[PDB]
Coordinates of all heavy atoms in Angstrom, one line a residue:
Chain A
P66 N -12.8 6.0 -31.6 CA -11.4 6.5 -31.3 C -11.3 7.9 -30.7 O -10.3 8.2 -30.0 CB -10.8 6.3 -32.7 CG -11.6 5.4 -33.4 CD -13.0 5.3 -32.9
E67 N -12.2 8.8 -31.1 CA -12.2 10.2 -30.7 C -12.7 10.5 -29.2 O -12.7 11.7 -28.9 CB -12.7 11.2 -31.8 CG -14.2 10.8 -32.1 CD -14.6 9.7 -33.0 OE1 -13.6 9.0 -33.6 OE2 -15.8 9.7 -33.3
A68 N -13.3 9.5 -28.6 CA -13.8 9.7 -27.2 C -12.9 9.0 -26.2 O -12.4 8.0 -26.4 CB -15.2 9.2 -27.1
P69 N -12.8 9.6 -25.0 CA -12.2 9.0 -23.9 C -12.9 7.6 -23.5 O -14.2 7.6 -23.5 CB -12.4 9.9 -22.7 CG -12.8 11.3 -23.4 CD -13.6 10.9 -24.6
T73 N -11.4 3.2 -17.2 CA -9.9 3.6 -17.3 C -9.0 2.5 -17.6 O -7.8 2.7 -18.0 CB -9.5 4.4 -16.1 OG1 -9.6 3.6 -15.0 CG2 -10.3 5.6 -15.8
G74 N -9.4 1.2 -17.4 CA -8.8 0.1 -18.2 C -7.8 -0.8 -17.3 O -7.3 -1.8 -17.7
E75 N -7.4 -0.2 -16.1 CA -6.2 -0.9 -15.4 C -6.7 -2.2 -14.6 O -5.8 -2.8 -14.1 CB -5.5 0.1 -14.5 CG -6.1 0.5 -13.2 CD -7.1 1.6 -13.3 OE1 -7.5 2.0 -14.4 OE2 -7.5 2.3 -12.3
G78 N -8.7 -7.9 -17.2 CA -8.3 -9.2 -17.1 C -8.0 -9.6 -15.7 O -7.3 -10.6 -15.3
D136 N -7.1 -7.4 -4.1 CA -6.1 -7.0 -5.0 C -6.1 -5.4 -4.9 O -7.2 -4.8 -5.2 CB -6.4 -7.4 -6.4 CG -5.5 -7.2 -7.6 OD1 -4.9 -6.0 -7.4 OD2 -5.4 -8.0 -8.6
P137 N -4.9 -4.7 -4.6 CA -5.0 -3.3 -4.5 C -5.4 -2.5 -5.7 O -6.0 -1.5 -5.7 CB -3.5 -3.1 -4.0 CG -2.7 -4.2 -4.5 CD -3.6 -5.4 -4.4
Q138 N -5.0 -3.1 -6.9 CA -5.3 -2.5 -8.3 C -6.7 -2.5 -8.4 O -7.3 -1.5 -9.0 CB -4.5 -3.2 -9.3 CG -4.4 -2.4 -10.7 CD -3.2 -2.6 -11.4 OE1 -2.1 -2.7 -10.8 NE2 -3.2 -2.6 -12.7
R145 N -11.2 5.4 -8.3 CA -10.8 6.3 -9.5 C -11.9 6.5 -10.5 O -12.3 7.6 -10.8 CB -9.6 5.7 -10.2 CG -9.3 6.3 -11.5 CD -8.0 5.7 -12.1 NE -7.5 6.1 -13.3 CZ -6.6 5.7 -13.8 NH1 -5.9 4.6 -13.2 NH2 -6.0 6.2 -15.0
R149 N -14.3 9.9 -11.1 CA -14.3 10.3 -12.5 C -15.8 10.6 -12.9 O -16.2 11.6 -13.5 CB -13.6 9.4 -13.4 CG -13.7 9.8 -14.9 CD -12.7 8.8 -15.6 NE -12.7 9.3 -17.1 CZ -13.2 8.5 -18.0 NH1 -13.7 7.4 -17.7 NH2 -13.3 9.0 -19.3
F152 N -17.3 13.8 -11.3 CA -16.6 15.0 -11.6 C -17.6 16.2 -11.9 O -18.6 16.0 -12.6 CB -15.7 14.9 -12.9 CG -15.0 16.3 -13.3 CD1 -13.9 16.8 -12.6 CD2 -15.6 17.0 -14.3 CE1 -13.3 18.0 -13.0 CE2 -15.0 18.3 -14.7 CZ -14.0 18.7 -14.0
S160 N -8.1 10.8 1.5 CA -8.2 9.3 1.2 C -7.2 8.6 2.1 O -6.3 9.2 2.6 CB -8.1 9.0 -0.3 OG -6.7 9.0 -0.6
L162 N -5.2 4.7 2.2 CA -5.0 3.3 1.8 C -4.5 2.4 2.9 O -3.8 2.9 3.8 CB -3.9 3.3 0.7 CG -4.5 3.5 -0.6 CD1 -4.6 5.0 -0.9 CD2 -3.9 2.8 -1.8
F164 N -2.6 -1.2 3.7 CA -1.8 -2.3 3.0 C -2.2 -3.7 3.5 O -1.8 -4.6 2.7 CB -0.4 -2.0 3.0 CG 0.4 -2.2 4.4 CD1 0.6 -3.5 4.8 CD2 0.7 -1.1 5.1 CE1 1.3 -3.6 6.2 CE2 1.3 -1.3 6.4 CZ 1.6 -2.6 6.8
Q175 N -7.2 -17.6 10.8 CA -6.1 -17.0 11.5 C -6.3 -15.4 11.8 O -6.8 -14.7 10.8 CB -4.8 -17.2 10.7 CG -3.4 -16.7 11.5 CD -2.2 -17.1 10.8 OE1 -1.4 -16.1 10.4 NE2 -1.9 -18.3 10.7
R178 N -2.2 -9.8 12.6 CA -1.4 -8.9 13.6 C -1.2 -7.5 13.1 O -1.1 -7.2 11.9 CB 0.1 -9.5 13.8 CG 0.0 -10.8 14.6 CD 1.4 -11.4 14.8 NE 1.3 -12.7 15.4 CZ 1.3 -13.1 16.7 NH1 1.7 -12.1 17.5 NH2 1.2 -14.4 16.9
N179 N -1.3 -6.6 14.1 CA -1.0 -5.2 13.8 C 0.4 -4.9 13.9 O 1.2 -5.8 14.1 CB -1.8 -4.2 14.7 CG -1.6 -4.5 16.2 OD1 -0.4 -4.7 16.6 ND2 -2.6 -4.6 17.0
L180 N 0.8 -3.6 13.5 CA 2.3 -3.3 13.5 C 3.0 -3.3 14.9 O 4.1 -3.1 15.0 CB 2.5 -2.0 12.7 CG 2.3 -2.1 11.2 CD1 2.5 -0.8 10.6 CD2 3.2 -3.2 10.6
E229 N 9.1 4.0 17.6 CA 10.4 4.1 18.3 C 10.2 3.8 19.9 O 11.1 2.9 20.4 CB 11.0 5.4 18.1 CG 12.4 5.5 18.8 CD 13.1 6.9 18.7 OE1 12.7 7.8 17.9 OE2 14.1 7.0 19.5
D232 N 9.2 0.0 20.5 CA 10.2 -0.9 20.1 C 11.3 -1.1 21.2 O 11.9 -2.1 21.2 CB 10.8 -0.9 18.7 CG 9.9 -1.3 17.6 OD1 8.9 -1.9 17.9 OD2 10.3 -0.9 16.4
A234 N 10.4 -0.9 24.5 CA 9.8 -1.4 25.7 C 10.2 -2.9 25.9 O 10.4 -3.6 24.9 CB 8.4 -1.1 25.6
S235 N 10.1 -3.4 27.1 CA 10.4 -4.7 27.3 C 9.2 -5.6 27.0 O 8.1 -5.0 26.8 CB 10.6 -5.0 28.8 OG 9.5 -4.7 29.6
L236 N 9.4 -7.0 26.7 CA 8.3 -7.8 26.4 C 7.3 -7.8 27.5 O 6.1 -7.7 27.2 CB 8.9 -9.2 26.2 CG 7.9 -10.4 26.0 CD1 7.1 -10.1 24.7 CD2 8.5 -11.7 26.0
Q237 N 7.7 -7.8 28.8 CA 6.7 -7.7 29.9 C 5.8 -6.4 29.8 O 4.6 -6.4 30.0 CB 7.3 -7.8 31.2 CG 6.2 -8.0 32.4 CD 5.4 -9.3 32.2 OE1 6.0 -10.5 32.2 NE2 4.1 -9.2 32.0
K247 N 2.2 -12.1 23.8 CA 2.5 -11.7 22.5 C 2.4 -12.9 21.6 O 1.9 -12.7 20.4 CB 3.7 -10.9 22.3 CG 3.9 -10.1 21.1 CD 5.1 -9.1 21.1 CE 4.9 -8.2 20.0 NZ 6.0 -7.2 19.9
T297 N 8.3 8.1 5.4 CA 9.1 8.3 6.6 C 8.4 9.6 7.3 O 7.6 10.3 6.7 CB 10.5 8.6 6.3 OG1 10.6 9.7 5.5 CG2 11.2 7.4 5.7
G301 N 14.1 10.4 10.2 CA 14.9 9.3 10.2 C 14.2 7.9 10.5 O 14.9 6.9 10.6
Chain B
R21 N 4.8 -7.5 -4.4 CA 4.8 -6.3 -3.7 C 6.3 -5.9 -3.3 O 7.2 -6.7 -3.5 CB 4.1 -6.5 -2.2 CG 2.8 -7.1 -2.3 CD 1.6 -6.2 -2.7 NE 0.4 -7.0 -2.9 CZ -0.3 -7.3 -4.0 NH1 0.1 -6.9 -5.2 NH2 -1.4 -8.0 -3.8
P66 N 11.7 -11.6 30.2 CA 10.6 -10.6 30.3 C 11.1 -9.1 30.3 O 10.4 -8.2 29.8 CB 9.8 -11.0 31.5 CG 10.2 -12.5 31.6 CD 11.6 -12.6 31.2
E67 N 12.2 -8.8 30.9 CA 12.6 -7.4 31.2 C 13.4 -7.1 30.0 O 13.8 -5.8 30.0 CB 13.4 -7.3 32.5 CG 14.6 -8.1 32.6 CD 14.4 -9.6 33.0 OE1 13.3 -10.1 33.4 OE2 15.4 -10.3 32.8
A68 N 13.6 -7.7 28.9 CA 14.3 -7.3 27.7 C 13.3 -6.9 26.6 O 12.3 -7.7 26.4 CB 15.3 -8.3 27.3
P69 N 13.6 -5.9 25.7 CA 12.9 -5.8 24.4 C 13.1 -7.1 23.6 O 14.1 -7.7 23.5 CB 13.4 -4.6 23.8 CG 14.4 -3.9 24.9 CD 14.8 -5.1 25.8
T73 N 10.3 -7.7 16.1 CA 9.2 -6.8 16.5 C 7.8 -7.7 16.3 O 6.8 -7.1 16.9 CB 9.1 -5.6 15.8 OG1 9.0 -5.7 14.3 CG2 10.4 -4.7 16.1
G74 N 7.8 -8.8 15.7 CA 6.7 -9.8 15.9 C 5.6 -9.7 14.9 O 4.7 -10.7 14.8
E75 N 5.5 -8.7 14.0 CA 4.3 -8.6 13.0 C 4.3 -9.6 11.9 O 3.3 -9.6 11.2 CB 4.1 -7.2 12.6 CG 5.1 -6.6 11.6 CD 6.4 -6.0 12.2 OE1 6.7 -6.2 13.4 OE2 7.0 -5.2 11.5
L77 N 4.9 -12.9 12.6 CA 4.6 -14.2 13.2 C 3.4 -14.9 12.5 O 2.3 -14.2 12.4 CB 4.4 -14.2 14.6 CG 5.7 -13.9 15.5 CD1 5.3 -13.7 16.9 CD2 6.7 -15.1 15.4
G78 N 3.5 -16.0 12.1 CA 2.4 -16.8 11.5 C 2.4 -16.6 9.9 O 1.5 -17.2 9.3
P137 N 2.7 -7.9 1.6 CA 3.3 -6.6 1.9 C 3.7 -6.5 3.4 O 4.7 -5.8 3.8 CB 2.2 -5.6 1.6 CG 1.0 -6.3 1.7 CD 1.2 -7.8 1.3
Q138 N 3.1 -7.3 4.4 CA 3.4 -7.2 5.7 C 4.9 -7.9 6.0 O 5.5 -7.5 6.8 CB 2.3 -7.8 6.6 CG 2.6 -7.6 8.2 CD 1.4 -7.3 8.8 OE1 0.5 -6.6 8.3 NE2 1.3 -7.9 10.0
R145 N 11.4 -2.7 8.7 CA 11.3 -2.2 10.0 C 12.3 -2.7 11.0 O 12.9 -2.1 11.8 CB 9.8 -2.5 10.5 CG 9.3 -1.7 11.7 CD 9.6 -2.6 13.0 NE 8.9 -2.1 14.2 CZ 7.5 -2.3 14.4 NH1 6.8 -2.9 13.6 NH2 7.0 -1.9 15.7
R149 N 15.7 -0.9 12.8 CA 15.8 -1.1 14.2 C 17.3 -1.6 14.6 O 17.8 -1.1 15.4 CB 14.6 -1.9 14.7 CG 14.8 -2.1 16.3 CD 13.6 -2.8 16.9 NE 13.7 -2.8 18.4 CZ 13.9 -4.2 18.9 NH1 14.0 -5.2 18.3 NH2 14.0 -4.2 20.2
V157 N 16.6 6.1 8.3 CA 15.9 6.0 7.0 C 15.6 7.4 6.3 O 15.1 8.2 7.0 CB 14.4 5.4 7.3 CG1 13.6 5.1 6.0 CG2 14.5 4.1 8.1
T167 N -1.4 -9.5 -8.3 CA -1.7 -10.4 -7.3 C -1.8 -11.8 -7.7 O -2.7 -12.2 -8.5 CB -3.1 -9.9 -6.6 OG1 -2.8 -8.6 -6.1 CG2 -3.6 -10.8 -5.5
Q175 N 0.6 -13.7 -17.6 CA -0.1 -12.5 -18.1 C 0.7 -11.3 -17.8 O 1.2 -11.1 -16.7 CB -1.5 -12.6 -17.4 CG -2.5 -11.4 -17.8 CD -3.9 -11.6 -17.2 OE1 -4.6 -12.6 -17.3 NE2 -4.4 -10.6 -16.4
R178 N -0.7 -4.7 -16.1 CA -1.0 -3.4 -16.6 C -0.6 -2.3 -15.5 O -0.8 -2.5 -14.4 CB -2.5 -3.2 -16.9 CG -3.0 -4.0 -18.1 CD -4.5 -3.8 -18.4 NE -4.8 -4.8 -19.5 CZ -4.9 -4.6 -20.7 NH1 -4.7 -3.3 -21.2 NH2 -5.2 -5.5 -21.6
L180 N -1.0 1.9 -14.2 CA -2.1 2.6 -13.9 C -2.7 3.4 -15.0 O -3.7 4.1 -14.9 CB -1.8 3.5 -12.6 CG -1.7 2.6 -11.3 CD1 -1.2 3.4 -10.2 CD2 -2.9 1.7 -11.1
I228 N -3.0 11.5 -13.5 CA -4.1 10.6 -13.9 C -5.4 11.3 -14.4 O -5.9 10.8 -15.4 CB -4.5 9.8 -12.5 CG1 -3.3 9.0 -12.1 CG2 -5.8 9.1 -12.6 CD1 -3.0 7.8 -12.8
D232 N -7.1 10.5 -18.2 CA -8.3 9.9 -18.3 C -9.3 10.7 -19.2 O -10.4 10.2 -19.5 CB -8.9 9.6 -16.9 CG -8.3 8.5 -16.1 OD1 -7.6 7.7 -16.8 OD2 -8.5 8.4 -14.9
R233 N -9.0 12.0 -19.4 CA -9.7 12.9 -20.3 C -9.3 12.7 -21.8 O -9.9 13.4 -22.7 CB -9.7 14.3 -20.0 CG -10.4 14.7 -18.6 CD -10.2 16.2 -18.4 NE -10.7 16.4 -17.0 CZ -11.9 16.4 -16.6 NH1 -12.9 16.3 -17.4 NH2 -12.2 16.6 -15.3
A234 N -8.2 12.0 -22.0 CA -7.7 11.9 -23.5 C -8.4 10.9 -24.1 O -8.9 9.9 -23.6 CB -6.2 11.5 -23.4
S235 N -8.6 11.1 -25.5 CA -9.3 10.1 -26.3 C -8.6 8.8 -26.4 O -7.3 8.7 -26.2 CB -9.6 10.6 -27.7 OG -8.2 10.7 -28.4
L236 N -9.2 7.7 -26.6 CA -8.6 6.4 -26.9 C -7.5 6.5 -27.9 O -6.4 5.9 -27.8 CB -9.6 5.3 -27.3 CG -9.1 3.9 -27.6 CD1 -8.5 3.3 -26.4 CD2 -10.1 2.9 -28.1
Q237 N -7.8 7.1 -29.1 CA -6.7 7.2 -30.1 C -5.5 8.0 -29.6 O -4.4 7.5 -29.9 CB -7.3 8.0 -31.3 CG -6.3 7.8 -32.6 CD -6.1 6.4 -33.0 OE1 -7.0 5.6 -33.4 NE2 -4.9 5.9 -32.8
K247 N -4.6 -0.4 -26.8 CA -4.8 -0.7 -25.4 C -5.4 -2.0 -24.9 O -4.9 -2.5 -24.0 CB -5.7 0.6 -24.9 CG -5.8 0.6 -23.3 CD -6.5 2.0 -22.8 CE -6.1 2.2 -21.4 NZ -6.8 3.4 -20.9
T294 N 0.3 3.9 -5.4 CA -0.7 4.8 -5.1 C -0.6 5.2 -3.6 O -0.8 4.3 -2.8 CB -2.1 4.2 -5.4 OG1 -2.2 3.8 -6.8 CG2 -3.2 5.3 -5.1
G296 N -2.1 8.0 -2.1 CA -3.2 8.7 -1.5 C -3.7 9.9 -2.4 O -3.6 9.7 -3.6
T297 N -4.3 10.9 -1.8 CA -4.7 12.1 -2.7 C -3.9 13.3 -2.2 O -3.6 13.3 -0.9 CB -6.1 12.2 -2.7 OG1 -6.6 12.2 -1.5 CG2 -6.9 11.1 -3.5

Side-chain angles (χ1 to χ4, degrees):
Chain A
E67 58 276 2
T73 61
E75 75 277 15
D136 183 326
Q138 188 147 333
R145 173 180 176 173
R149 179 170 182 252
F152 176 80
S160 76
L162 281 86
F164 68 81
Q175 186 169 117
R178 293 181 187 260
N179 59 43
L180 289 172
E229 181 180 350
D232 286 350
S235 67
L236 179 63
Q237 193 57 63
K247 192 167 193 184
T297 59
Chain B
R21 311 287 175 246
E67 56 281 350
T73 64
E75 70 274 20
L77 289 172
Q138 190 145 323
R145 190 268 193 83
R149 179 171 178 254
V157 186
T167 300
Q175 182 173 304
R178 291 179 187 263
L180 294 175
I228 293 291
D232 288 344
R233 288 177 193 291
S235 70
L236 179 67
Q237 190 62 63
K247 192 170 199 185
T294 301
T297 48

